[model samples]
Target: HWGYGKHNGPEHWHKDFPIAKGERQSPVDIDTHTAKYDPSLKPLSVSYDQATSLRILNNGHAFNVEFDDSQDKAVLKGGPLDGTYRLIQFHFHWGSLDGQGSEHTVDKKKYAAELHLVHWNTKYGDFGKAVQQPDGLAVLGIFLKVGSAKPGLQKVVDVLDSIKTKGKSADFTNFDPRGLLPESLDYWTYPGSLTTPPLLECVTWIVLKEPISVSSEQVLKFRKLNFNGEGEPEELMVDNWRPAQPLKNRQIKASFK
Candidate 1:
């Protein structure tokens, strides 16, 4: 299921999820001069234990992970973010090449790829209901640029063989999503919504300025994921990335300090 044609690609995701039209999408062109800074918004620390409960899910559009509540250690449990939320899911947005992969842009620059770690506020009872609220979600976005060799990403790449076909999924047992994170934790935060449909306006966007590196081959492997059945063999489902949207009135805050 590699080639599903243009109409079936990522550009049509909004059609499946209508809310995407009005959502405060990220990867927006960030203008440093015009943006406001929040000194009170300090950097929160996350641990590896909390990042281990990640589950890789092939959601047709792309491969993403659903975070389990058991992994509480990785949540940013202190400081200004104390008692705010819990980790939920993490996924990525990409393109066919290194020149254009990330969903969000900074001054018209698009990185190789973007990873989003989703979280929900506990005050709303649970993540599902919280997602419906105005301030129910938090997403941490990390950019990926083509570089030398990435041992971190290889961990996930190694399993591609198991889930090579559409609707096929392999249990990522004993896998840790934290292993995929880059060394730097410095990031930018803002109020936004889910980039996909039903684009809820309850997400807190935390995008890291730094990006991780991966080989071109790894990217090609990602492109091989099929949106249709593998029986056709000839149809390669490539290019499953959503197009960037307008920022509207949203403000993106960075942790430069």
Candidate 2:
């Protein structure tokens, strides 16, 4: 029953996935003032092949851009990672309103929305098994701000008609994910968990210091999606995010001041 609703939402996540209560849970507040500048952090080296981007799906949680990770075609290296992590999929977390959608807040402030690009370490051979370990995943968070129309974003929005309901899927290929990134690769690095359960604390969170721009009209269209599948009560796919978690002893290391 766990989902984005009152009974099955983030707060109730721990009821089923005990790891959700862990100290390293994700979507934590990124306090820029207290973060330490680490010059040792490497610049993000991203090599994404547009041909490998296979499909998109409205999996009842978010519209995920799935990739064909059968080969090492699309991968993200450098930054805080020790080895290569292959790109799996990219998804978003958002709310009904523009300012209320993002999961990770900067200085306790919410952005219009947040995007997560999921990756798994090649050391484990398979993503399904790697996630069970303590340091098996790396997720890139790109915050979305409401502004000018983005061509790459418009390409995605145009496909919403096919995936308006849950379980709906459509092919989305030859789209370079780089088109959605910001001007800067500077980021804040931290050890965090997956925002959704089973909330594995196996992620090296690489959050870009800069945010990409999207139009308010695009956000409104995204909100029109359904969280429930066909034949069920239609629920808008908004506020599909977890509240900020406690940072505890974990310190955020910034690539730049």
Off by over 4 Å in 1: 1-5, 8-18, 70-73, 77-82, 232-237
Per-model TM-score versus the true fold: 0.85, 0.97
Clash count list over all predictions: 10, 2
The stretch of ten residues in a row with the least summed lDDT in candidate 1 is 1-10
lDDT of 2: 0.89
Worst 10 residues of 2 by lDDT: 45-54
TM-score of 2: 0.97
Report the C-alpha lDDT of model 1 over 129-180, residue by residue, as the tens digit.
9888777876777888887767867867877766666666766656676767
Total clashes in model 1, counting residue pairs 3 or more apart in sequence or in different chains: 10
Q: List model 2 lDDT by residue over 1-257, tens digit each.
A: 77888789888888899988898999899999999999888888888854378899999999899988878888999998989999999999988887788889999999989989999999998888879877799999999999997778888898998999989999998878877888898999999999987898889999998999998888888998998898899899999999899998799999997
**Residue 13 lDDT, candidate 2, scale 0-100:** 88
